[PDB]
């Protein structure tokens, strides 16, 4: 029941393969919905459920805004290089903004900036204040706090326009966003030196949240479990692994336990 709309704008001073000079991308509930970059010079849809509910006027508006951002990012990279007394080279400037609809029906708004991979400045729409996360951002906090009309336009957008769009987009995406795909689980084992490494892998599940654990005689072995981060497949489903090292003679005591929204009860799996 929670939802999110987020835009990420990223500029680099020294482009490379896969890293255009400027990119702007949108995400709904973590799903990529559109893309602009400095090479294409236009914003296009990246999910057919989004494409089927938008039109040329919509994309031309996103393109005009993204072209404006691209111009601003080129100026800001040079402002930041001078702010920090840096040489020319490889630098990154980033913005993330957007809005959340939470489980209680309440909303949150975001507008935050990162320079060189570090928090720089962030806007609090509830208070109309900027917070400098780095000393070199205090000059910017003072400049941008004098721009009251612009702050009010951001507040109105984050609280109204952004959420109004998110609620529509969640409706456009219902068939994809609300789907459930079960994990396909495999247990494998490797004996090395009177150590047996048991591996449990869950494949192809959706949505992303999952619980995977190793049990000994039904008892969770949390301190002994190694687990990977949840990572995506090419079809937008997910994968996770968990391992445990056990005495080969005790192999029959161990089961992998998987819990997921697609499953009507916990999955229990033996090697």
């Amino acid at each position: 029941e929670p939802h999110s709309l987020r835009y990420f704008d990223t500029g680099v001073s020294d482009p490379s393969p896969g890293v255009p000079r400027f990119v702007s991308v949108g995400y709904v509930d973590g799903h990529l919905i559109d893309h602009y970059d400095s090479e294409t010079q236009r914003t296009e849809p990246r999910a057919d459920w989004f494409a089927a509910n938008t039109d040329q006027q919509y994309w031309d508006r996103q393109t005009e805004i993204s072209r404006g951002a691209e111009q601003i990012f080129r100026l800001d990279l040079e402002t930041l290089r001078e702010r920090y007394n840096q040489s020319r080279g490889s630098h990154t400037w980033q913005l993330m903004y957007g809005c959340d609809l939470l489980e209680d029906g309440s909303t949150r708004g975001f507008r935050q900036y990162g320079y060189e991979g570090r928090d720089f400045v962030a806007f609090d729409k509830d208070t109309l204040t900027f917070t400098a996360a780095d000393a070199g951002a205090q000059i910017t906090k003072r400049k941008w706090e004098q721009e009251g009309t612009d702050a009010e336009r951001w507040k109105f957008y984050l609280e109204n326009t952004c959420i109004e769009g998110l609620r529509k987009y969640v409706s456009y995406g219902k068939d994809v966003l609300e789907r459930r795909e079960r994990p396909e689980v495999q247990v494998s084992g490797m004996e090395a030196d009177k150590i047996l490494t048991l591996s449990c892998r869950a494949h192809g599940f959706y949505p992303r949240p999952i619980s995977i654990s190793w049990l000994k005689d039904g008892m969770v072995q949390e301190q002994e479990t190694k687990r990977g981060s949840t990572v995506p497949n090419s079809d937008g489903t997910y994968h996770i692994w968990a391992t445990i090292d056990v005495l080969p003679g005790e192999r029959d005591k161990y089961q992998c336990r998987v819990e997921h929204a697609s499953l009507p009860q916990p999955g229990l799996f033996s090697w």
């Binding site: 896969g18 990529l32 495999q186 497949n233």
Partner: protein
């Protein structure tokens, strides 16, 4: 200082591995900054066919992620790796698909 965050890499198959059965090999690279990176899928150290490279995605902590994937039919003996070059590493790092 500028973040110099090392890529964290996982190499995994789309479906449970069965020697001889059609599958997809995935390399997911995350946690890194700056965004410049080179990722290759290799079979016995040589370039794999039919690789797709998804556009990078973006974290709220100013790190990036990339998924790279290709068709494969895993055998008992073949060695599949993901080779990653990033400024956080002195030399490119290899990550093995565990059979």
């Amino acid at each position: 200082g500028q973040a110099k965050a090392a890529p964290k890499v996982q190499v995994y198959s789309r479906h449970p591995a069965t020697a001889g059965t059609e599958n997809i090999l995935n390399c997911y690279v995350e946690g890194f900054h700056p965004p410049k990176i080179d990722i290759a899928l290799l079979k016995n150290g040589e370039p794999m066919k039919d690789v797709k490279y998804n556009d990078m995605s973006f974290g709220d902590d100013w790190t990036f992620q990339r998924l790279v994937y290709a068709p494969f039919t895993p055998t008992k003996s073949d060695v599949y790796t993901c080779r990653v070059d990033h400024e956080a590493f002195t030399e490119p790092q290899s990550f093995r698909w565990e059979p």
